[PDB]
């Protein structure tokens, strides 16, 4: 059929498999449905509507733009980065196809391409390892853009690359008064404090996300990690299983795909269920019920 042909033609340099069980490309004007679905909450199926609209227009420059960000928000970092790369090779001049291709690139701890992605992002800018040239070009220490969100608020990923969890904390704390409304940006200073111990004082910002976006699934993951680091197993497990439960909403009986992207999540209930000696779930709970 025409839909099947669309699927094999997508199965290309633009592979992005995304098992076809969603009836949203059947719905007309999917772009509007996509923008209206996340206007309140639940970016999960909003990312699905973005997939639906982006599936039949390969040349749509802005289709991949929000799709990459919303697929990075929902913790599925794997297919989102290759989708963003395919977006980048089409129009290789945009901050969105480079900023989200740099910070999310470090979640896999691939320090190689992150530096060149940062270089590409800083390219437009109309006005103990390699580091040196990239960091010097970045700098911009109150040179002519004091309190510049995209630069001053950002670039903490560079600090996170060097595992220097002392300068990043301040570089993010005194970077949120400007543009003081972005739940995703909160995560940027929500985990960098957690990674340097200090679990309690990094907890509040997590609830801060719930102040504006009570639909995030990565904030719940981060707070479960922090609680597990604090060895408070029971409610940590309860809240993380709530996080997986909220990760899939609606089309869930048919909303599954390759079932590898939600692997680490379906691993983190492990490494904890063996600490309170209950077990009894182990490999038996393999059906993701």
């Amino acid at each position: 059929a025409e839909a099947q042909e669309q699927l094999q033609r997508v199965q290309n340099e633009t592979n992005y498999p995304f098992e076809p069980n969603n009836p949203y490309m059947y719905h007309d004007k999917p772009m509007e449905e996509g923008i209206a679905m996340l206007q309140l909450a639940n970016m999960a199926e909003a990312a699905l509507a973005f997939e639906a609209v982006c599936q039949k227009e390969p040349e749509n420059v802005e289709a991949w733009r929000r799709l990459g960000t919303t697929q990075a928000e929902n913790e599925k970092d794997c297919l989102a980065i290759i989708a963003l790369n395919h977006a980048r090779m089409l129009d290789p001049k945009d901050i969105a196809v480079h900023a989200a291709l740099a910070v999310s690139h470090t979640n896999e701890h691939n320090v190689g391409a992150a530096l060149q992605s940062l270089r590409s992002w800083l390219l437009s800018q109309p006005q103990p390892s390699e580091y040196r040239d990239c960091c010097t070009l970045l700098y911009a220490a109150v040179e002519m853009n004091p309190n510049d969100p995209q630069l001053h608020a950002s670039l903490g990923v560079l600090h996170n690359l060097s595992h220097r969890f002392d300068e990043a904390a301040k570089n993010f704390r005194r970077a949120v008064e400007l543009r003081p409304d972005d739940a995703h940006m909160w995560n940027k200073l929500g985990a960098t404090l957690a990674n340097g111990n200090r679990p309690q004082e990094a907890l509040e910002a997590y609830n801060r996300a719930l102040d504006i976006n009570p639909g995030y699934v990565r904030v719940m993951y981060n707070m479960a990690v922090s609680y597990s680091n604090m060895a408070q197993y029971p409610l940590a497990a309860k809240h993380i299983t709530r996080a997986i439960a909220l990760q899939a909403g609606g089309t869930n009986p048919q909303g599954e795909g390759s079932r590898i992207a939600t692997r680490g999540l379906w691993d983190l209930l492990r490494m904890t269920l063996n600490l309170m000696d209950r077990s009894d779930l182990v490999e038996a709970s393999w059906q993701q019920d």
């Binding site: 970092d77 985990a191 993951y221 990690v225 060895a231 490494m271 600490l275």
Partner: peptide, 12 residues
């Protein structure tokens, strides 16, 4: 040993 075995990475 418990701390070593409960090692997890928070995603930024």
């Amino acid at each position: 040993i418990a701390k070593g075995e409960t090692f997890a990475r928070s995603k930024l």
